[PDB]
């Protein structure tokens, strides 16, 4: 179960066998192994990774001493891939090759305080026939005296997006090792320049 | 609507409980490197008129 840290860069389409395949491009590589989680000391099995070189100025003291014990220069992000122990001490895009199949995890685009129609695909009220100031309003939220209360988890308006989202079974279309590029046919969570994670798929 | 009205007069305790978040935060201030007078940061010194080490306006 292999993973890699990366940044979403932007979408395009290419042509493969006279078919148009819309891809998103992810600057994945390279990710230096900064720490290894072993059952003896930690309990599970995982690898702490690193992304984006950082100003050794910007990196504070306790962080600095951490990076150093591993031999890594300061890097902007630490994230762990679970159940992963690569042979080397640095991960590149070349742990995927075209035809594979990935799960991609990012932070979705935040829609802030979203209405009930945007957030929950509700249908609001009529826009004529006497409908009165309720065109985007949810409707009834409960019953009457029995139960006399509102179900926990009731779909109401509130913040939507800027949450973790994982998309599954995405075809690895091509890998550009030199420029550390990973191609993936489909839609990846989040904005361009957003941090993402690319693991091997859970599906089969 | 049907004119939502309050049910019970709120307690002394409860309204003060509501107001635990009402304390003003005192103005944040720094000494002006030229005339030593306590002024707001990132603002032209209102008591000698200096900012960024030079004279900017008249005070």
């Amino acid at each position: 179960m292999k993973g890699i840290l990366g940044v979403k860069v932007g979408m395009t389409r290419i042509f493969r066998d006279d078919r148009a395949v819309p891809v998103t491009v992810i600057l994945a590589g390279p990710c230096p192994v900064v720490q290894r989680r072993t059952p003896e000391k930690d309990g599970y099995t995982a690898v702490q990774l690193g992304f984006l070189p950082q100003n050794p100025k910007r990196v504070n003291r306790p962080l600095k001493g951490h990076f150093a014990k591993a031999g890594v220069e300061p890097v902007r992000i630490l994230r762990e891939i679970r159940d992963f122990n690569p042979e080397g001490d640095t991960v590149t895009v070349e742990i995927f090759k075209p035809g594979e199949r990935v799960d991609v995890t990012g932070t979705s685009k935040g829609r802030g305080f979203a209405g009930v129609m945007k957030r929950w695909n509700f249908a609001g009220g009529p826009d004529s026939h006497g409908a009165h100031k309720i065109h985007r309003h949810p409707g009834s939220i409960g019953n009457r005296k029995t139960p006399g209360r509102v179900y926990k988890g009731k779909k109401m308006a509130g913040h939507y997006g800027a949450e973790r989202v994982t998309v599954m079974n995405l075809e690895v279309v091509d890998v550009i090792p030199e420029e550390n590029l990973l191609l993936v046919k489909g839609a990846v969570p989040g904005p361009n320049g957003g941090l993402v994670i690319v693991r091997e798929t859970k599906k089969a | 609507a049907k004119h939502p009205v309050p049910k019970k007069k709120t307690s002394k305790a409860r309204r003060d409980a509501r107001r635990s978040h009402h304390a003003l935060t005192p103005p944040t201030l720094v000494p002006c490197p030229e005339c030593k007078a306590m002024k707001p940061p990132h603002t032209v010194c209102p008591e000698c008129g200096y900012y960024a080490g030079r004279k900017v306006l008249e005070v």
């Binding site: - | 002024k39 990132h42 603002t43 032209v44 010194c45 209102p46 900017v56």
Partner: protein, 118 residues
């Protein structure tokens, strides 16, 4: 939402917002320094810097251009004759926005000054 949008609305509609910027360009280019509210000030920088740059060009097209926002041929002459020469080598950044320490009394609005650079 507002994602990746440029420019405040400043609680004015489309013509009023444009007028607001024009009259301030008129004022700023006339006195070389004006006090305003801090949001307005930051907004003034570019609207004016475009005009100074077009002044730096000097061709007849540019003057006729600036005229649409400033309307004043004497003023525009100050812009091409006296103001623009000061900037032949300055690569943009012809304006400065400094924040003032005290506030308006009637609404505590925070104030700033906008002047033209030396």
């Amino acid at each position: 939402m507002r994602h990746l949008k440029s420019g405040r609305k400043l609680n004015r509609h489309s013509s009023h917002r444009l007028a607001l910027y024009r009259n301030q360009a008129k004022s700023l280019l006339t006195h070389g320094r004006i006090t305003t509210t801090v949001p307005k000030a930051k907004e003034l920088r570019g609207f004016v810097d475009h005009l100074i740059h077009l002044a730096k060009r000097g061709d007849l097209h540019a003057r006729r251009l600036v005229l649409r926002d400033l309307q004043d041929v004497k003023l525009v002459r100050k812009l091409f004759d006296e103001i623009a020469p000061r900037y032949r080598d300055r690569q943009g950044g012809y304006t400065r926005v400094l924040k003032l320490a005290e506030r308006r009394r009637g609404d505590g609005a925070p104030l700033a000054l906008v002047e033209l650079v030396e």
